[PDB]
Design a protein around this motif. Structure first.
Motif, PDB file in Angstrom:
ATOM      1  N   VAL B  18       0.849  -1.184   0.000  1.00 19.10           N
ATOM      2  CA  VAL B  18       0.000   0.000   0.000  1.00 19.10           C
ATOM      3  C   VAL B  18       0.886   1.236   0.000  1.00 19.10           C
ATOM      4  O   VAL B  18       1.901   1.286   0.702  1.00 19.10           O
ATOM      5  CB  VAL B  18      -0.957   0.021   1.209  1.00 19.10           C
ATOM      6  CG1 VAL B  18      -2.004   1.101   1.036  1.00 19.10           C
ATOM      7  CG2 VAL B  18      -1.618  -1.327   1.377  1.00 19.10           C
ATOM      8  N   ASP B  19       0.500   2.233  -0.788  1.00 13.04           N
ATOM      9  CA  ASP B  19       1.235   3.485  -0.899  1.00 13.04           C
ATOM     10  C   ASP B  19       0.428   4.603  -0.251  1.00 13.04           C
ATOM     11  O   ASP B  19      -0.703   4.876  -0.663  1.00 13.04           O
ATOM     12  CB  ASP B  19       1.526   3.807  -2.363  1.00 13.04           C
ATOM     13  CG  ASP B  19       2.225   5.132  -2.537  1.00 13.04           C
ATOM     14  OD1 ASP B  19       3.084   5.462  -1.698  1.00 13.04           O
ATOM     15  OD2 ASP B  19       1.921   5.841  -3.517  1.00 13.04           O
ATOM     16  N   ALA B  20       1.011   5.244   0.760  1.00  8.72           N
ATOM     17  CA  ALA B  20       0.399   6.389   1.433  1.00  8.72           C
ATOM     18  C   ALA B  20       1.005   7.654   0.836  1.00  8.72           C
ATOM     19  O   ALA B  20       2.025   8.157   1.301  1.00  8.72           O
ATOM     20  CB  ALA B  20       0.617   6.315   2.939  1.00  8.72           C
ATOM     21  N   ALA B  21       0.362   8.179  -0.200  1.00  8.05           N
ATOM     22  CA  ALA B  21       0.886   9.297  -0.977  1.00  8.05           C
ATOM     23  C   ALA B  21      -0.155  10.402  -1.078  1.00  8.05           C
ATOM     24  O   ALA B  21      -0.473  10.902  -2.158  1.00  8.05           O
ATOM     25  CB  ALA B  21       1.333   8.836  -2.360  1.00  8.05           C
ATOM     26  N   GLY B  22      -0.714  10.786   0.063  1.00  2.00           N
ATOM     27  CA  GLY B  22      -1.794  11.750   0.091  1.00  2.00           C
ATOM     28  C   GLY B  22      -3.059  11.102   0.604  1.00  2.00           C
ATOM     29  O   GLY B  22      -4.168  11.437   0.184  1.00  2.00           O
ATOM     30  N   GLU B  31      -8.862   0.317   6.374  1.00  2.79           N
ATOM     31  CA  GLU B  31      -8.703  -0.744   5.389  1.00  2.79           C
ATOM     32  C   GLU B  31      -7.536  -1.662   5.726  1.00  2.79           C
ATOM     33  O   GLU B  31      -7.612  -2.869   5.475  1.00  2.79           O
ATOM     34  CB  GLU B  31      -8.525  -0.141   3.994  1.00  2.79           C
ATOM     35  CG  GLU B  31      -8.122  -1.134   2.905  1.00  2.79           C
ATOM     36  CD  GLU B  31      -9.219  -2.125   2.535  1.00  2.79           C
ATOM     37  OE1 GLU B  31     -10.314  -2.089   3.138  1.00  2.79           O
ATOM     38  OE2 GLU B  31      -8.981  -2.952   1.630  1.00  2.79           O
ATOM     39  N   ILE B  32      -6.460  -1.120   6.298  1.00  2.00           N
ATOM     40  CA  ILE B  32      -5.328  -1.955   6.683  1.00  2.00           C
ATOM     41  C   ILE B  32      -5.718  -2.901   7.811  1.00  2.00           C
ATOM     42  O   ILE B  32      -5.391  -4.093   7.780  1.00  2.00           O
ATOM     43  CB  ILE B  32      -4.123  -1.077   7.065  1.00  2.00           C
ATOM     44  CG1 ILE B  32      -3.451  -0.521   5.812  1.00  2.00           C
ATOM     45  CG2 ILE B  32      -3.121  -1.864   7.883  1.00  2.00           C
ATOM     46  CD1 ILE B  32      -2.445   0.558   6.098  1.00  2.00           C
ATOM     47  N   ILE B  57       4.723   1.872   2.154  1.00  2.00           N
ATOM     48  CA  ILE B  57       6.000   2.354   1.624  1.00  2.00           C
ATOM     49  C   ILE B  57       6.227   3.842   1.890  1.00  2.00           C
ATOM     50  O   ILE B  57       7.309   4.233   2.320  1.00  2.00           O
ATOM     51  CB  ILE B  57       6.132   2.003   0.123  1.00  2.00           C
ATOM     52  CG1 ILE B  57       5.041   2.666  -0.716  1.00  2.00           C
ATOM     53  CG2 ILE B  57       6.160   0.502  -0.074  1.00  2.00           C
ATOM     54  CD1 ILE B  57       5.264   2.541  -2.200  1.00  2.00           C
ATOM     55  N   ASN B  58       5.248   4.702   1.624  1.00  2.00           N
ATOM     56  CA  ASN B  58       5.455   6.144   1.795  1.00  2.00           C
ATOM     57  C   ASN B  58       4.826   6.623   3.105  1.00  2.00           C
ATOM     58  O   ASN B  58       3.856   7.377   3.131  1.00  2.00           O
ATOM     59  CB  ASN B  58       4.905   6.906   0.593  1.00  2.00           C
ATOM     60  CG  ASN B  58       5.776   6.758  -0.640  1.00  2.00           C
ATOM     61  OD1 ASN B  58       6.966   7.057  -0.610  1.00  2.00           O
ATOM     62  ND2 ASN B  58       5.182   6.306  -1.733  1.00  2.00           N
ATOM     63  N   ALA B  59       5.421   6.177   4.215  1.00  3.17           N
ATOM     64  CA  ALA B  59       4.846   6.465   5.527  1.00  3.17           C
ATOM     65  C   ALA B  59       4.835   7.958   5.829  1.00  3.17           C
ATOM     66  O   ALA B  59       3.851   8.482   6.361  1.00  3.17           O
ATOM     67  CB  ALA B  59       5.611   5.716   6.615  1.00  3.17           C
TER      68      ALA B  59
END
Ligand code: MG
Ligand code: MG
Ligand code: MG
Ligand code: MG
Ligand code: MG
Ligand code: MG
Ligand code: MG
Ligand code: MG
Ligand code: MG
Ligand code: MG
Ligand code: MG
Ligand code: MG
Ligand code: MG
Ligand code: MG
Ligand code: MG
Ligand code: MG
Ligand code: MG
Ligand code: MG
Ligand code: MG
Ligand code: MG
Ligand code: MG
Ligand code: MG
Ligand code: MG
Ligand code: MG
Ligand code: MG
Ligand code: MG
Ligand code: MG
Ligand code: MG
Ligand code: MG
Ligand code: MG
Ligand code: MG
Ligand code: MG
Ligand code: MG
Ligand code: MG
Ligand code: MG
Ligand code: MG
Ligand code: MG
Ligand code: MG
Ligand code: MG
Ligand code: MG
Lengths: 110, 142, 55, 117, 103
Positions: B18-22, B31-32, B57-59
């Motif tokens: 999962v990418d946290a990018a905004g 969801e996690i 990945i993008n914490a």
RNA sequence: GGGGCUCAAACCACACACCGAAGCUGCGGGUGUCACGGUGACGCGGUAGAGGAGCGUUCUGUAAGCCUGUGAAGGUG
RNA sequence: AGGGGAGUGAAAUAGAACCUGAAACCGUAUGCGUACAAGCAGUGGGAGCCUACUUGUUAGGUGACUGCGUACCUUUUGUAU
């Protein structure tokens, strides 16, 4: 084989005697006699004669060899206790229990 | 005819990334925690771990709304008198970016030995890459 | 000060998990073959291969 | 006619202590503690026969939700579409097909979805 | 080759040659019984979803025995109110064997 | 209550769906009262307390019987 | 002191502290569980392991993990108190 020897009414507390009982559990009688001969506990002196009596019973009544035996079972049970009176301060009286125990040692050549 | 129950020696676990990018912090964390527990599978049972493996990945690029970037505080006590300590969202992001996502997900999981096993399947990193290429994660949206 | 509740069977047996006894260091005097305490004179009266007290 | 209590009283304590088998400490070997433990155990058993029916329905509903969302529908819409069409299958059987007979579960969700509910 | 039938107020997923315990029926032992309240029949990969019930399908069974379940014990206790009551219960059941499923 | 929530996971209106109790229905049992001659209908939370029906223990008659060393009472599964 | 054999006896685990010999309490042996885990210690669900045999829709022993769950009596308007 599994020949036994018992000592009834040994004048010592069972909890004190059980500390030496599990020091020799499962060992060869050759090295169990060395441990008891050089121990500083009073119960080791009492329990040494029960172990040698069992060995003598093995050699005479069953024709065994001391080099083949090992301590297969050992346990300490409680006996009957004497009751005494202990005077305390200000007229109070206490009851003293003098405990004893039964010691059973078994040697087996298997 | 008894109800099916999942056995821990037979469950099938999969890896996602999962990418946290905004992403809104709390709406990403619901969801996690759903995936970590197994609620998305018909084989879910309350007393075994049937979840999946989640990699984030993008914490450090996770996002909040309103004015929470400065007014959201994290409190912990050290056990000594007067040992209350606080930090806000900006300073925690700069200091320990992964602790923000881990703290939000942890509060949405059961507080018991089973809930600590689900937390062990969450991997959070502050870069753009992860060391889990051998497990071959696959993309997961939101 | 005295207990408000009596100890359980398990509770007092965990305290006694440190009451076991250790063994002594024994050696065999090769000249005679006799078992003795390490660094001590044997009950016979030998030490390190010599007679010291001869009963 | 003097009556002694020895035989009857002993036969009554042994009945309670047999039900307290497996309990911890004094709860399995002294009568005063074991009698209270047996009564509380029966109290829980009466209450938990009601709760067994609740706990299993909450587990069937959770599994149907997980299997309906894999076919593109939520639980609350699937139940509305099953009532709308005609289907009156249990939740227990529906949750069984979700785990085991996955192809038959899809046909039910597709049938419920054709009722536009 | 299974089926879903309604009997005793409950529903059972049923396969051929199966033994299951059901609520008590007023049928003598060894007598054949049939269930025309059939909800779903799946023969291999072909499923017939029963609008109310599947038209024409029937499941044939025969009664094996009658018996009672294990005893459950009911206790009703109200603490420090001087009240207690005890009760026992064994539920009746009928064991049936599923001979054939006709879709 | 916590996590967390900002075109809300807040507030104000309207709409449809679902969850939710030992409530109601379904299936199988037990009981009280009344009516009719086993069926019907209508009940069955409960302290102080009132009413009804029972279990078990010791002794007496039945019994100068019956059981019992091919094993009584008692103890333990 | 106390025992191990041998003998007597229908029976010595009927051996003199001697008929029977329960419970509390204390031990030895075997099986399973227990050293990242919070609370009346059970109850509902439940994997794994062990034993027996009718070889798994069975019986017996343990109960990892999980939902719910603040003893009993008395006295009180009211007690986990
Ligand atoms: Mg004086
Ligand atoms: Mg004392
Ligand atoms: Mg909870
Ligand atoms: Mg204390
Ligand atoms: Mg106190
Ligand atoms: Mg402790
Ligand atoms: Mg100590
Ligand atoms: Mg147990
Ligand atoms: Mg016991
Ligand atoms: Mg509804
Ligand atoms: Mg209900
Ligand atoms: Mg009702
Ligand atoms: Mg009825
Ligand atoms: Mg009443
Ligand atoms: Mg009522
Ligand atoms: Mg006999
Ligand atoms: Mg008598
Ligand atoms: Mg003879
Ligand atoms: Mg005897
Ligand atoms: Mg005798
Ligand atoms: Mg005696
Ligand atoms: Mg006699
Ligand atoms: Mg005797
Ligand atoms: Mg005893
Ligand atoms: Mg012990
Ligand atoms: Mg052990
Ligand atoms: Mg930890
Ligand atoms: Mg642990
Ligand atoms: Mg603790
Ligand atoms: Mg806690
Ligand atoms: Mg169970
Ligand atoms: Mg079992
Ligand atoms: Mg449990
Ligand atoms: Mg539990
Ligand atoms: Mg609870
Ligand atoms: Mg008062
Ligand atoms: Mg007052
Ligand atoms: Mg209290
Ligand atoms: Mg209260
Ligand atoms: Mg108190």
């Amino acid at each position: 084989m599994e020949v036994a020897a018992k000592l009834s009414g040994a004048r010592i507390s069972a909890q004190k005697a059980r500390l030496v009982a599990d020091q020799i559990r499962g060992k060869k009688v050759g090295e169990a006699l060395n441990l008891l001969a050089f121990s500083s506990k009073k119960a080791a002196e009492i329990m040494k004669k029960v172990l040698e009596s069992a060995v003598a019973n093995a050699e005479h009544n069953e024709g065994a060899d001391v080099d083949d035996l090992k301590v297969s079972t050992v346990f300490v049970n409680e006996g009957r206790s004497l009751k005494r009176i202990m005077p305390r301060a200000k007229g109070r009286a206490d009851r003293i229990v003098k405990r004893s125990c039964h010691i059973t040692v078994k040697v087996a050549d298997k | 005819m008894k109800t099916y129950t999942a056995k821990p020696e037979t469950v099938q676990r999969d890896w996602f990334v999962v990418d946290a990018a905004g992403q809104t912090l709390g709406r990403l964390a619901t969801e996690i925690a759903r995936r970590l527990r197994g609620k998305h599978k018909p084989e879910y049972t309350p007393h075994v771990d049937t979840g999946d493996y989640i990699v984030v990945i993008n914490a450090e690029q996770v996002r909040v709304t309103g004015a929470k970037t400065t007014d959201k505080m994290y409190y912990h006590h050290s056990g000594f008198p007067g040992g209350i300590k606080s930090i806000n969202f900006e300073k925690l992001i700069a200091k320990a970016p992964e602790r923000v996502i881990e703290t939000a997900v942890k509060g949405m999981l059961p507080k018991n030995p089973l809930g600590r096993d689900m937390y062990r399947k969450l991997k959070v990193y502050k870069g753009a890459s992860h060391p889990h290429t051998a497990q071959q994660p696959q993309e997961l949206k939101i | 000060a005295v207990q408000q509740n009596k100890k359980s069977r398990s509770a007092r047996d965990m305290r006694r998990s440190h009451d076991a006894l250790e063994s002594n260091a024994l050696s065999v005097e090769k000249s005679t073959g006799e078992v003795h305490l390490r660094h001590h004179v044997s009950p016979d009266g030998f030490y390190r291969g010599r007679k010291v007290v001869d009963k | 006619a003097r009556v002694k209590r020895g035989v009857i009283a002993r036969r009554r304590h042994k009945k309670i202590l047999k039900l307290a088998k497996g309990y911890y400490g004094a709860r399995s070997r002294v009568f005063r503690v074991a009698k209270q433990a047996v009564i509380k155990a029966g109290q829980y058993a009466y209450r938990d026969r009601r709760q067994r029916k609740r706990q299993f329905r909450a587990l069937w509903i959770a599994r149907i939700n997980a299997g309906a969302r894999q076919n593109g529908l939520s639980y609350s819409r699937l139940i509305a579409g099953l009532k709308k069409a005609a289907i009156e299958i249990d939740r227990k059987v529906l949750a069984d097909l979700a785990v085991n007979e996955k192809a038959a579960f899809t046909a039910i969700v597709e049938k419920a979805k054709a009722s536009l509910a | 080759m299974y089926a879903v039938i309604v009997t005793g107020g409950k529903q059972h997923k049923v396969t051929e040659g199966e033994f299951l315990k059901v609520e008590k029926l007023d049928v003598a032992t060894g007598e054949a019984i049939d269930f025309d309240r059939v909800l779903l029949v799946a023969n291999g990969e072909d499923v017939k979803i029963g609008l109310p019930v599947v038209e024409g399908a029937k499941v044939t069974a025969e009664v094996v025995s009658h018996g009672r379940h294990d005893k459950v014990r009911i206790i009703k206790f109200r603490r420090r109110k001087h009240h207690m009551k005890r009760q026992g219960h064994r539920q009746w059941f009928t064991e049936i064997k599923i001979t054939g499923i006709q879709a």
